[PDB]
Amino acid sequence: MTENQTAHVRALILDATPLITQSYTHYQNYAQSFYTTPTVFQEIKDAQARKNLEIWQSLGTLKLVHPSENSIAKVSTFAKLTGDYSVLSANDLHILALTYELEIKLNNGDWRLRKKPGDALDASKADVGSGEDTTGSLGVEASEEDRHVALNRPENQVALATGDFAVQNVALQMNLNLMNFMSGLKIKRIRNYMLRCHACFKIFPLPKDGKPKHFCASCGGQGTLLRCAVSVDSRTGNVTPREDQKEYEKVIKQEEWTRRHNEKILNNWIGG
Amino acid sequence: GRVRTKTVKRASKALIERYYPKLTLDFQTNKRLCDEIATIQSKRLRNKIAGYTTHLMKRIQKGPVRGISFKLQEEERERKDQYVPEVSALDLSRSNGVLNVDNQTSDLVKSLGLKLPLSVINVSA
Amino acid sequence: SLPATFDLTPEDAQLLLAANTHLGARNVQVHQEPYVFNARPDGVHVINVGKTWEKLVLAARIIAAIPNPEDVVAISSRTFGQRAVLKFAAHTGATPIAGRFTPGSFTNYITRSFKEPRLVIVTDPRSDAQAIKEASYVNIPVIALTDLDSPSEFVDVAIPCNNRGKHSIGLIWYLLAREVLRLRGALVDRTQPWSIMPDLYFYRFP
Amino acid sequence: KFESRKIMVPPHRMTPLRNSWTKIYPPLVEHLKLQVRMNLKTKSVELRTNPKFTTDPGALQKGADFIKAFTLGFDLDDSIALLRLDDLYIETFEVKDVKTLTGDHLSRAIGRIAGKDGKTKFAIENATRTRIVLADSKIHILGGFTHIRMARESVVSLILGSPPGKVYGNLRTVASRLKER
Amino acid sequence: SNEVLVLRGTLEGHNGWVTSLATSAGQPNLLLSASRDKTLISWKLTGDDQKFGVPVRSFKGHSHIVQDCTLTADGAYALSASWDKTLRLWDVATGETYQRFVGHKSDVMSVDIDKKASMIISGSRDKTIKVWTIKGQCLATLLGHNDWVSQVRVVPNEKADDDSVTIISAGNDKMVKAWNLNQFQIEADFIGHNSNINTLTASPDGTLIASAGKDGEIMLWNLAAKKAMYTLSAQDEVFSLAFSPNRYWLAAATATGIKVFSLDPQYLVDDLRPEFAGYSKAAEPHAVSLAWSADGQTLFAGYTDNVIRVWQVMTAN
């Protein structure tokens, strides 16, 4: 006799990681509406993921929604302000733009969203109606009327289910609701590793390709970049913790050509 | 191999660096275009040059090529000055008016004899 | 032999410590030991910025000492350096060399890249070392921007700064430009700040 | 009906292990259908099988041979050749086993098997269908017996102190009646 | 409530670029096509959802490719302009050439006949617009253009030809010329274009001039007031223009598609981009000719991939 677990979120944006890791039954008890981008669905290539996508398409709960271009420009401006645009993919930017558009449509405005990083939220319009620290969401024995009141609240109108730490930091900079793909609880703080200059004290994120930066982006010190753990609070929005040679560009192009030739040789070995 | 001669290549390079916009993907218009602008002594060579300008109109419409075009060079003439920030990183408000300076450079400030909004930060190893 | 107004104005010192010019490399040569004050104990040395100010005051006096303003030549091959020297050449009328400096340009009059200067500014004397050694053949003073582990041979009036960061190189080119235009006479009042901001010289990669 | 083998990871090659492991595991996991588990702390790799895998008992020995190959300096294209073929095997041998050498004699013997820009090493991979990795005192040649046997004759010529020109002449002689047949 | 243009079929009979389309007023079924396959092909069309009926005639008399064609009010004569420095008058039933117009020293781009079938102009890139009759006598030679004359048209008179024979020509010197053909001199000049003007057309009442070219500026001139009204932006290069005979629609043949603008009210109606197979986005065929039918419901359209398309006006929800 399973209890009727009511959905605490009206709409949840699902990434490829939560779609591959969890089934539709795991997300059925948490969210009422499922929305996703078509490019993220087209990027799925695993057979069990294709079977789960076919089961979700037979269920019909997932909505394939493309984000708007103006919200994409706002998300790109926010990512350029936060510096996470270099690591974030275009699908991640489109998912963030679709989440921003869903939060604008659900809350009937952008009062809960921060235009710039570190900007204070406009709380005057609220009276007109894995390294993730998810503590504080436990021990809440809400009733059915309390679950309906929480789903009627504007803070639980939209959620972003993703596994990308750059997208999670972009949502924390945008003060967006982040939910665990396995637990479903609202994320309060996230701890990630960031590159810190040992002299200039400049903060940059981890690389997407995993290659270590031999020169810093601002300092230029050889070995000045160090792995520094950074914590980001969703309420505050504050993250709490040469290359000029043409031969360097030639070495980078030779490494890229070697990686492409190795990928071609691996594809010929697999297909041979 | 049918590698074209250097006169056709250089004439097409000059006529596409200077006479870009009226040339198009149609060879038949480009034939009397290079008739009306260029004095080429033979029908064969002007057919070579007109076909090569047609092919360079074919791949120029997909992206930029290393050669000179005007409609980009105005754009890197305002690329030099259009992105001036209203507040730079060297301004005070990005560090709330007080600098993030170690003890030794604060000793430089108090030894040289200047007054400056410094926050001493203790760093080690 | 200078008036007392020429020294460090405190907003320029705030500007210098904002661009992290005082941070440098880990090796200290025998020649550039007086530019260091002491070492922050990780391996990073901190430099006397009053020496950088008064040393660029010398370099500004060298540039103002030439009669023909088109005869000074700026040299660059670093990625920040091309933008820095094209702004300097736009603002003082110098002749810039951006990107690959052509060999045989200071001898060999045949080449169209033959310019003979009387005065040469170089972004760093290691990557642009070929203009240094070709200017060592036809008797040219070179004032340069040297780090704490730059090669110190064949330079005179060398300005200690940071060539590693774009902040420091764009700022130090901006300060040389404003020092020579305040010394030539294009901006009469010594009290008045220069109308162009230093972030014009700063490099952005889109 | 599981089976697991235990193998040792050298310290000199664990950084290319973590560099090119993304190219190492999915060809063998997809095409050869095995299971791999790491122990990065205890320098051990767990190559395991399952009845839920395909029944192929010899490819478990082959997979242990791929990681035994990668133990001793060997790249991934020789792992593709070891995937596709069966006659290709591995060998070690010592510099001191031919001739008692010491110090700079050892260094000159390593220089003789290495050569100027690795050119005598290049001449011994291309003419014999062999692949060459030099250790501090170990020589490593892959391949089949007709191939590695004339590789033996060449390398015991060369580590005995014979000049590399006689090595080139005997090398093209044995390569000539190698490709002749 | 919207008026939606839906593609209903194709017309393939050519081997060159279909550079002109002509419609008839005596019968609505006749479509005359001038193409770059050195021939002209007439058509009677059986309206179906995939095909059209009869490849009626082939008019081969031209040494080079054929640029322009026009039809009479009855629809019995075909008047062609080609690159062989001549113009030809055809019979649409069999293909006899009545007379060949030989006065031009270079290649001809446009031809237009009057309303009474007596008064023939010829537009060529030799900086010369020549005047012909039906029997083929060159009675005038109009000069003044400093560059190519891409297109010529005859303005429809609004007061039953009150002794003002007016024609309009858009030159390739960023300038539009309008002539009065009673005394053969320049009447008005329309300065304000910035690139070469590929086409121009006249309104059915004869008071509006729509000219566009490479710059994408469909500049609307008022011919009756002899002034410039306003500018419409069509982005990319525009090849052919035609006015709706019943509606106030102005449809352009752009390089990306067919953009249909509306003069009252000022809005863009449709952007017709047909589907293509096996071609890149920089390799999609574009429209170089279009023509409106006698009722204003059928929009003919000629492209560069040897296929003539049609579009019909319906009423949506």
SS3 C166: helix
**Is A265 close to D27, i.e. CB distance below 8 A?**
no
CATH number of the domain to which C16 belongs = 3.40.50.10490
Size of interface B-C (CB pairs under 8 A): 63
Asked whether residue C7 is assigned to any structural domain, the reply reads no
Q: Residue A210: closest CA among chain D residues belongs to which residue?
A: D19
DSSP string, E65-83: -EEEEEE-SSS-EEEEEES
End-to-end CA distance of chain A: 54
Please provide the DSSP assignment of A78-129 as one string: HHHHHTTTTTS-HHHHHHHHHHHHHHHHHTTSSTTS-SSTTPPP-GGGTT--
Q: For C40, which of B109, B114, B123 is closest by C-beta distance?
A: B123
* Beta pairing partners, E81: E68, E87
Q: Does E309 touch chain B (CB under 8 A)?
A: no
Q: Is A243 on the interface with C (CB under 8 A)?
A: yes
Number of domains comprising chain C = 1
Task: For residue B122, give the chain C residue with the closest CA.
Answer: C40
- Model resolution, angstroms: 3.8
Chains that touch C (3 or more CB pairs under 8 A): A, B
CA atoms of D44 and E245, how far apart (whole Å): 84
Bridge partner list, E303: E287
Interchain CB distance below 8 Å, C166 and A221: no
Residues A51/A199, Cβ–Cβ less than 8 Å = no
Q: Is C touching D (3+ C-beta pairs, cut-off 8 A)?
A: no
In this structure, chain A runs to a length of 272
B48: containing domain: 6-61
Chain B closest-CA separation from residue E119 CA (Å): 29
Give the nearest chain B residue to C87 (CA atoms). Answer: B80
Sheet containing E87-91: which strands, arranged edge to edge? Answer: E66-71, E77-82, E87-91, E97-101
Range of the domain at C146: 12-206
**Residue E294 corresponds to which amino acid?**
A
Residues of A with CB under 8 A from a CB of D: 262, 265-266, 269-270, 272
- Whether E147 and B36 have beta carbons less than 8 Å apart is answered as no
Distance set, CA C105 to CA C113, C145, C151 (Å): 6, 21, 22
E18 contacts E32 by C-beta, under 8 angstroms? no
What contacts D149, CB < 8 A, 6 or more positions away?
none
Closest CA to E107 of E77, E142, E63: E63
Which CATH number characterizes residue E53's domain? 2.130.10.10
Strands (DSSP E) found in A102-205? 132-133, 158-161, 178-179, 189-197, 203-205
Q: Do C165 and A243 touch (CB under 8 A)?
A: no
The structure was resolved experimentally with cryo-EM
Distance in angstroms (rounded) separating the CA atoms of residues E29 and E22: 11
Separation between Cα atoms, residue E285 and residue B26, nearest integer Å: 12
The answer to the question of residue C4 being in a domain is no
The Cα–Cα gap between B109 and B118 comes to 9
Cβ contact (<8 Å) for B21 and E214? yes
Search chain B and give the residue with CA nearest E284.
B25
Of C10, C168, C201, C18, nearest to C92 by C-alpha is C201
CB pairs under 8 A between A and D: 12
- Looking at the DSSP bridge assignments, the partners of residue E243 are E250
Q: Which residues of A touch C20 (CB under 8 A)?
A: 199-200, 219
Question: Judging by DSSP bridges, how do beta strands E208-212 and E217-222 pair with one another?
Answer: antiparallel
Nearest to A28 by CA among A5, A1, A58, A55: A5
- Token pair of B121, please? 């930060």
CATH of the domain at B52: 1.10.60.20
Q: How far is it, in rounded angstroms, from Cα E118 to Cα E103?
A: 18
SS (H, E, C) chain B: CCCCCHHHHHHHHHHHHCCCCCCCCCHHHHHHHHHHHCCCCCHHHHHHHHHHHHHHHHHHCCCCCCCCCHHHHCHHHHCCCCCCCCCCCCCHHHHCCCEEEEHHHHHHHHHHCCCCCEEEECCCC
- Please compute, for residue D32, the number of CA atoms within 13 A of its CA located in the half-sphere on the CB side: 27
Q: Is D29 on the interface with A (CB under 8 A)?
A: no
Q: Which residue of chain B has the CA closest to C39?
A: B104
B117: nearest CA partner in chain C: C14
In chain E, the number of structural domains is 1
* Chain B contact for E196 (CB, 8 A cutoff): yes
Which chain B residue has the Cα nearest residue C83?
B80
Report the candidate in D87, D47, D98 with the shortest Cα–Cα distance to residue D70: D47
Q: Order the strands of the E175-180 sheet from edge to edge.
A: E149-154, E166-171, E175-180, E185-191
CB-CB contact of E145 with E127 (8 Å): yes
Helix (H, G, I), strand (E, B) or coil at E253: strand
- Strand ranges, E, within C58-195: 72-75, 95-97, 119-122, 142-146, 158-160
Distance CA B31, CA B15 (A): 13
Angle value at C-alpha A238, between B123 and A80, nearest 5 degrees: 105
- D96 reaches A (C-beta below 8 A): no
Shortest alpha-carbon distance between residue D177 and chain A (Å): 30
- Other CB atoms within 10 Å distance of the CB of residue E84: 19
Give the tokens for residue A73. Answer: 């420009």
Cis upstream peptide for E265 (omega within 30°) = yes
Neighbours, chain A (3 or more CB pairs < 8 A): C, D
User: Is B85 in CB contact (< 8 Å) with chain E?
Assistant: no
Instruction: Choose the closest CB to C37 out of B81, B88, B108.
Output: B108
Asked if C44 and A221 come within 8 Å (Cβ–Cβ), the reply is yes
Helix (H) or strand (E) holding D158: helix D145-158
Per-residue b or e along E92-126, where b marks 16 or more CB atoms closer than 10 Å to that residue's CB: beebeeeeebebbebbbbbbbbbeeeebbbbbbbb
Q: At what angle do helices C10-18 and B103-112 cross, to 10 degrees?
A: 160
Chain B residues within 8 A of C19 when measuring between CB atoms: 90
Angstrom distance (rounded) from CA B19 to CA B14: 8
Contact A220, C162 (CB under 8 A): yes
